[PDB]
Every structure is written in structure tokens, then in C-alpha cells.
């Protein structure tokens, strides 16, 4: 509206993904860029050198700007700040060559910036902040404990991967950006609705980050459904990617069904109507951002 512009998703090559999802780009995207800069500067200040890109993407839109385009402008910078730290902390958790000395050495710095993000969120919106802290902690713990599990189906993998990829974490941030809280009743019913959305987000990331994650497998755990399909079905990269592409399309359709099924079995409030809409923008934003984000695409990298 006055906070985001509608963007024609057909102007992008999405490999058949994102059909019937609308795409929006936050008008205050510079605040997301500012949040990511400050987070990266604090990382070098308290942790160590930067070794990768996070949410930044000036071509197709900052991660926060397209994934969360309904965010209130006064909350976009902090959300992007949090996500940028999460982007960088994510690769630390996946690392397999980190010495016990460096892990001890970086523990206090990681703690400081984590506590800095939680404190700022609590000071702005306490109810929303508590959900962010809960999901953030659950994602880190789940990743730490379960990242080495050998899954033998995409279904089993996704129960872990939806948490590892940060889908509830990002949902909690999106609610904070809306200044929105759900009742425990609404929490219960909407959990079933957004499960295929979480899976679409997780598998879409696998699709577009597989090349980069294969490049890092010498030093990082490979958590990717493309690899799983390759092993269990004895397929090469593009054939496995096609199967994941098809699986993404299935989850995308299932999400649209559950949104409309919710609307049928339950006159919804305009709050829940906004919630449903905001969730669909995660799908289109995550998809378009992953197309040429420097994080996964080296010929878009700089500096
Ligand atoms: Mg990860
Ligand atoms: Mg990762
Ligand atoms: Mg990935
Ligand atoms: Na990895």
C-alpha cells in the first residue's frame, strides 16, 4: 500500500514455483539494508571476520523487504538486524571444522548479540518478543541436536527441517512486524494451516541453496532434501531437483487449500485475514529473493 509495492512475480524466472502467490516489496527497504549493515558491523566488532552474505539483495529485494513486506516501518530495521545475525549464526551451527577453542572463543560474542536482539525486541513488544525468543531458542537447539540425523524420507526430514530452517522463527518475526498476537485458540487452528507453507519454504531454500551447500560440504553439514532424494532414489542433481520442484508445488497448493478450507469451516477476522495474506508473501518473497541472492549465487557477490 503506502508501505509496500506490488511486484509482478511473472517478471521473474521462478522455475514454475510461486504460482498464484502475490509478491510485494517493502517501500522502506533501506531500513532493512540498514539493519543488516549494523548487524554485520557488530559481528566483526564482537565475533570475527565476515565470510558470507546474509539477507542482502539489492536486485530482487532485501530478504526482509520481500519476505515480510507488510512489516511496520518502525520495526523493519530491528527484524532485519535479527535475521542477519541469524543468517550468520546459521552457518556457524552447520560448521564441522570449528575448533573447540574457537567455539569457546566465539560463545560470549554470540551470546552478547543474541541477548542484544532479545532485549531490544522485549523493549518494543513484549508479547511478540517472547514468541521470538521461544522459537529462536528452539531452532538453535533442534539444529544443534539433530543436524546429523540420517532421515529416510522427505516427510521425516521436513519435521526437523521446518524448525531448522527457521520457519516458526520467521513467522514469529512477521507477527512482531505486524504488531500481531494470536490467541492460543488461533495458534492451534492456524498451526495446521501453515504446515505446508513451512514445508514449501524449507524445500524452496533447499532447491536454490543446494549448489552453494555442496560447495561448502568440505566444512559444513549438508542439510538438503535434494541430497536426500539423490541418495534414496539414485538420481543425479537436476532429476532430484525436479522431484523437489514438484514437491514444492504440491506444498504450495496444499497451503492454498488449507487457507481456503480454514475460511470455509471457520467469517474470519480481519486480523486472521491479514495473517493469512502475510504468510503467502513469505512464499513469494523467499522464492524471488533466492533467485539471485549473493548468499547462494556467487556471481552476484561483491566486496
Ligand atoms: Mg541451517
Ligand atoms: Mg544454512
Ligand atoms: Mg539452504
Ligand atoms: Na551446510
Residue numbers in the entry: 5 to 270, 272 to 308
Original authors' sentences:
Here, we describe the discovery that class I terpene cyclases are bifunctional, in that they catalyze both terpene cyclization and aromatic prenyltransferase reactions in the same active site. Class I terpene cyclases require 3 Mg2+ ions for catalytic function, and these metal ions are coordinated by conserved metal-binding motifs in a unique α-helical protein fold. Interestingly, the diterpene synthase FgGS can accept GPP as substrate donor to produce long-chain prenylindoles 11–14. Compounds 11 and 14 were characterized as previously reported (E)-1-(3,7-dimethylocta-2,6-dien-1-yl)-1H-indole and (E)-3-(3,7-dimethylocta-2,6-dien-1-yl)-1H-indole, respectively. This characterization implies that the active site cavity of FgGS is sufficiently large to allow the binding of indole as well as C5 DMAPP or C10 GPP to produce prenylindoles.
The crystal structure of FgGS complexed with Mg2+3-PPi and imidazole was determined at 2.15 Å resolution. The protein structure in this complex is essentially identical to that in the BTAC complex (rms deviation = 0.15 Å for 292 Cα atoms in monomer A). Metal coordination and hydrogen bond interactions for the PPi group in this complex are identical to those observed in the BTAC complex. Unexpectedly, imidazole and not indole is trapped in the active site of this structure. Imidazole was required for crystallization and the concentrations of imidazole and indole were 50 mM and 1 mM, respectively. Therefore, imidazole out-competed indole for binding in the active site during crystallization. Intermolecular interactions suggest that imidazole is bound as the positively charged imidazolium cation. The imidazolium N2-H group donates a hydrogen bond to the bridging oxygen of PPi, and the imidazolium N1-H group donates a hydrogen bond to a water molecule (monomer A) or ethylene glycol (monomer B). While all side chains of both complexes are in approximately the same position in the active site, R216 of the FgGS–Mg2+3–PPi–imidazole complex in monomer A adopts two conformations.
